[model samples]
Target chain A: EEYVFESPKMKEILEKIKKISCAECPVLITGESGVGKEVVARLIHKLSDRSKEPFVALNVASIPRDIFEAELFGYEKGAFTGAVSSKEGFFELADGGTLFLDEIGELSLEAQAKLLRVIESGKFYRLGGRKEIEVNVRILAATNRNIKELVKEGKFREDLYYRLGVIEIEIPPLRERKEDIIPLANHFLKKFSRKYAKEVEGFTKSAQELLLSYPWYGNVRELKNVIERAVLFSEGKFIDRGELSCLV
Target chain B: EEYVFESPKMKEILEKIKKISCAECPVLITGESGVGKEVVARLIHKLSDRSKEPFVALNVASIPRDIFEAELFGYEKGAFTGAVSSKEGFFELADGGTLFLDEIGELSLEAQAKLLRVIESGKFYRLGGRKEIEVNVRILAATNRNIKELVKEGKFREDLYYRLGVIEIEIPPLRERKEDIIPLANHFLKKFSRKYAKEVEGFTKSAQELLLSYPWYGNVRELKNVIERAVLFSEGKFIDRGELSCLV
Candidate 1:
């Protein structure tokens, strides 16, 4: 990402990523849901020596509660009621790379416990299988929730918390870091322009001011999503407030 | 004075305000219009141990030009025909207390330069007074404009910009701090109930959600005023989405 940032805070974060590449330990990224946690994870993976390896991403919250175990630890043929065939789970598939478990805080207590074990030991077992599979995979977890509060409430395992927090990086919300709004908005605009094949110019003065003034509660993801939708929706060469999402 | 704070960032501002009050430095409270700038100013004044003194409030933008100068600096007998007798302006009336200059950014370049001298020297002349009146007043200005940009454009005196920004406190827009909306909504609900003399309980869950979800471009003042108006027009105990003028 060749994003030019004049803000020292962002430059400092970029420099830190360049230095460590998160080589030594598991990295936990925490922020609001739309703060673009995956972007940070991707930077960590790409900057590290493991840049050549694939970066696999998954939303744990999106999966069903009942089948979370089977999803994480793939099942063997006839292992369960409707076990189709032998399949490698995310851990096995992203063997030499990183697995980004987004919304890790939303995982059920049982799933969290299972995750704790997987982090404690580099081994995971197939659901309903007697054998265990050992995989060399670096885990990266991202959550918007206050994990400490979750731990206090007994919803999240404290042991897992420590395991994931080997290296913690908190991505500040968009409102906190106002400097990033313009760059992030433009980044989205460029990408969406290509996606829509429209040579839309940048925002008008009033529109740009309006964009800058908005309290983006949903952060970068919301900004990008809104721009993408607006770029496609707008008939004009430039976007006004109308083209933006109704949410903002 | 009792502002609900959820984030550490806001708490940090409170700590800064504590130190800020110990000195006589001017403060710049910047935020969106209607985001409770006046409320923040009141808090600053109360926390500074100057609660016993007058907390003079003035909104320059809302004041028409015909009454602007007289309203701010006061006047003397037959001063420009309208002034029949001597009058004490906010700057003079707020002597030995905090004089809040709301919407200071809206002042013309000439007015801004004049204000700069008054704040720096703590002296001003009435509309027709011969002697210069000196007052021991603490200056605090709040605005919703990009003041720094205005300075660069030579619209605002640079020296005054530095003087006023000695201590800056940003009142977060309501949408950015969405958690406050529920509490604030309830506060307005109770406030308007007494005025309108209605047994309005609260917003329905959906209404509450809609309030939280709305952009709230006008901020807390807008929200409070809108809710008050909504309650006055409510047909039942519950103020649902339809009653919300902006959100609906």
Candidate 2:
């Protein structure tokens, strides 16, 4: 939430996000899975003209493929065996706003075809419905996979890929931006300490070195998670080397 | 490559492969990208009755989607525009042998369908052919991705998955197998020194400790690569801490 930056990579990514976030074209944000692709998506939507409108973030990872169309394009009551009530789809909810599709690589080929049509015309029909539904929603797609390779392999459609990648924003992983490590660690430490109703002191000398030297393989998510646990175990004392031994 | 093991995890995996390798059923090998999944597959093929037969290995990562059919199931000269002459497919080449499908996760839905049929009936027609061709090929598939999740998400077919996963063998990463580090490093050292025509001595005390302690993120590949560099740098001298400083 702080959007803190000290490294040049973050500064570069931020400027790119700021310049392109205002455009209506679909933008693709890519990085390692734990590099906080969702965070970048949120900031892009926040800077856009539709900031006041709802920001619907959809993680397409765990949803079952059986009701994928109904979940994605909405469904009329009694559309299928499981559809007892009508519900708004992701596109319908994000009308006049932004739809952040996280982990877009998980979608099936059938799902990809359906999404392609709606993205092309900005119009789609609800499942089992006769009338067409139209909406204006800015698209922001993120994935950790090499989508270009996926497209070449036909696991992903070339048409949909070209549209989503009108502009590309690739966030460098946290290890590549060591200057921002302490700032993020301290920020997370403060947030966790207060939430746990404890006033933990800062890290010891050795712990600080470990935090600076250790490679955060999962990037920002791992750093924040590590800081939260350290603050919890500190009991108001300085977080020491033993607490940071997990890095080894 | 020699099948060397100094860790209990690899010993357990070797036993699993030995027990399951001779069967007519298929095997699914799983591991991190650099954990040498192919090595396990090769050893399985060698230990089986098909050791004298050719072992056809297919890396599914780089092939184009359009020619996927021609590549998998041999094609006639007039199959497509680029078809200059008829060629043998992987299945046909490994008809009485082993077919090692590395990175099986890269296959598209269409490819998965074709593979499912041939794997089910051991009968498939070449591209633009009228008659069906039958083959008795033992199947071995490997991937770094979770195939179960891929099947659940409909990216991969369930029928194909059930056949490929008749047995599963997971290789533990190098970091988890620290006991095997020095053996691998020494093996690679002997190899590179012979190829490069330079005999480098063993590692220094600190260098050995670093080799044991450093977490190999990319596993065997990275370890072997780093050892090659260290050996090249050390001209008949023992590789010391400076050569191993890349770990820091």
Candidate 3:
């Protein structure tokens, strides 16, 4: 995963991943956008006993709210016009492994009910099929929004939230973890320079100052792009303030 | 150099690189920082007949101004305090190839004169050597500052400026190439996702809109960081606004 962080907050998160990776419990990763929630999820799967098994990721929000059931539980042949052949859903595909459900807050009430039932019973039924499919898949959910708020608003099921967040991990944003900014920038620079076959080494003093002083609202993601772009635009051995005018 | 651009302006730049890559004259590339000036230079070298030869890059500003000659022309074994052995400088290293001089405007007047003399005579002396070394090294330079302005300010030699910019290529800022933003974002997303072993497919509609609408003051570099950050924080198949709130 090529992940590195010097912040104590992130170090704690790493410790949690190591401790919980092999556990048979649901994990809910919470953070602001660009905070690498899915990265943590992937790490958990990699460290777990099911490392060799499939680690399927499903963006709960990307799926149409109405078709959530069909997408999650699979469908039998002739179940719908598009279902000319039987197909396995995320649950079936992720059997014996981890299923990372991203943007879990986007799930509707009906979808939440079905997800809870699957988590509780360890079994689910395919659409238009009489037989029930049994699978042992671990759940890992992530969201940027406040799910508790959503629950209070009646948009989310409180029971589902509790089921998903059995083990909670929250990632701090980039600005809050200022220690990682320069190191991350240097890391990305080395990465892109090698990728582009350029001989760029590092940032100039002013450039480093600029990077540190700038409020990276986008967090680490924003910082990564800046380094990549700097590498691309860099004409010298090091990135200078002139090359970092975009940040200005 | 895995470069991508959908904007016609960049398409024109690509065309220009193709036309100039095979040419034998010195070329100067100018652009805002993070605009990929060095990328274009590498592209030129790659497309040139000298593609098989080494393309050594030296940042003029990174080296001490007083030691420019020694750095560019190499030095004999007893030339300086740390000169344990005779060494080949950028010019010798890049012989039979291309020497990329970044931040050329930062070169001192004396260094410029020496560089101009070498360019005119096709020969230069090592720092403490009596012998003249003849070499065939094509020159490619880049800078974010206006060389002409530097010349007017008496900070740079105009003759050297004219000599270096025989063929000028200017890369527009990322904001100017609005059409390329989403495409480049998608490009970096694919790149970083594969690197991080994530299964991100694309950006959500709202995320796409956010990418398109954001003022990429940092240009392609900034956009790249944004995309990488999004990929890192991304939990869904598609990057949504929740993963891209930094732009907001």
Candidate 4:
């Protein structure tokens, strides 16, 4: 749960996020997967005046591709296939709070248009229902893809992009944040050591060499995985070069 | 070039190595690749009075299977297809120092029988030569693979095994020495940071977590590669989880 930050880029992003917190405007966060974009969004919400209100997270990409409209707007009882009961959509769920949409780029054009309308009016209608539901929820959309590239490719709507880009934050890759690697490595070691209840002393000098030398293509995800494996295989007290395998 | 020792197990190993280095008796060091077998071998040579003498190393497994016999024992002019001139063998080349046989387990069984004769008496004949040649050299063989397993599989000769096992030293894997991990990580950071002309501070807390989780199957070699890559890619003051794509 701890956020480790030392790089100037991360520092700048944090300062910008703090500024973006006070404004009641939509925010867009973009980065590679596992780069903690959602974490950033949540941090903004926590720091804002809406700290006590409910926070909602919606994965626009996870919604059914065909039933995208009904999924985001909710459905009335018997409104569609297997619609046995009326369900509240994220707009209703996030009332008086912040709405975080993950992988926002994955939404279909039609879904994107509907989402835009909902954001504009702060209201959505349930399928097969006559009345419109309204709520006061702040919008925050995060995506790992390069939206500008997608816009050039005609995959993302330019107007919608402007709406979400009231504030933008871009997280650099792990290599750019070298100052954070040691702290992160130690934190993971302690956490895993407690989780597994093993007295793993630490990495051998050679093992550290591997950690420092490895080009972690998967970033944090990859580091977490290697540490877990090292903990499991550790014999005696230390994990050594024998415990580490080369990609080559 | 630096050896970061912490665990008592490693200390014991070093003490044993020191005790065995006083004499020129044949020694066999065994360990997995990247486990510092060569380092240990060099230490043995350094401890001996012959430290200033030539210390030659040959990977018996690296040579072509067909030409291993000619390569190890040398061949006279026109001994084989590629042999345009006479060449001295490793035994001759290492006449005044140590002859390290790397991957000695890969030596063909036929070659083993021939090597046995040479080890028994400092006598060997070059290919297509009638002279009874002699050379004085210390023998040290190392293999990552289990020679005993090979013997069980009928791949290694029993009598040769006794000869090679004269002064046995097993280099334990890195995992068994977990106490050395962070020290080594820091050491590599310093070394590579200087080498790469980059001012990498160190790993962040989460970066430390990532390093601890890695399994590092390639042992020291893998760790070395990881550090080198991290040093090359790192920016700002330290390395974080973001820059770790180079690791497998």
The number of the candidate with the highest lDDT is 3
Cα deviation at B215, candidate 4, in Å, is 2.3
Residue pairs in clash, model 3: A221-B229, A224-B225, A225-B224, A225-B225, A229-B221, A233-B36
Where model 1 places Cα greater than 4 Å from the true spot, the runs are A1-7, A22-24, A128-131, A233-247, B1-248
Candidate 4 lDDT, tens digit per residue, A1-248?
A: 47777667887777767755654557789877766778888999988779778889978777776566566667564332455566776678888899888888887665665576566557654643434578888888899898988988979755466557545677766656666655566667777888999898687777766777666765666777778777777676777677767330
Q: What is the TM-score of chain B in candidate 2?
A: 0.93
| Candidate 4 or 2, higher lDDT | 2
Q: Which candidate number would show the highest TM-score if scored against the true structure? A: 3
TM-score of each: 0.47, 0.50, 0.52, 0.48
lDDT against true structure, model 1:
0.71
Summarize candidate 1's per-residue lDDT along B179-223 as a digit string, tens digits. 778888888898789778998999988698889887788887778
Candidate 2 per-residue C-alpha lDDT over A120-155 given as tens digits, one digit per residue, 9 for 90 to 100: 888887765464677899888999888989987889
Task: Give the Cα error of residue B74 in candidate 1, in Å.
Answer: 77
Can you tell me the DockQ of model 3?
0.01
Query: Individual DockQ of the candidates?
Result: 0.01, 0.01, 0.01, 0.00
- What's the lDDT for all of these models? 0.71, 0.75, 0.78, 0.71
Docking class of 4: incorrect
Tens digits of per-residue lDDT, candidate 3, A1-248, equal: 37687778887788898999659799999887667887888899999889998887755643335556765776665555543345466787788989988778878788788899888888877764464677899999999889889987999999988888799999888878777888888888998788655699998988888888887655775676556656755568888888777533
TM-score of 4: 0.48
What lDDT does model 3 reach?
0.78
i-RMSD values for every candidate model? 34.0, 19.1, 29.7, 32.3
* Residues A1-248 of candidate 1: C-alpha lDDT, one tens digit per residue: 57544445666666766776747478888887566577778788888888899666655643445545665656565555443345457777677888888778878887788777777777777765465787777888998888999988998888889999988878777777777877777787887677556688677665677778777666765565556655654567788766653535
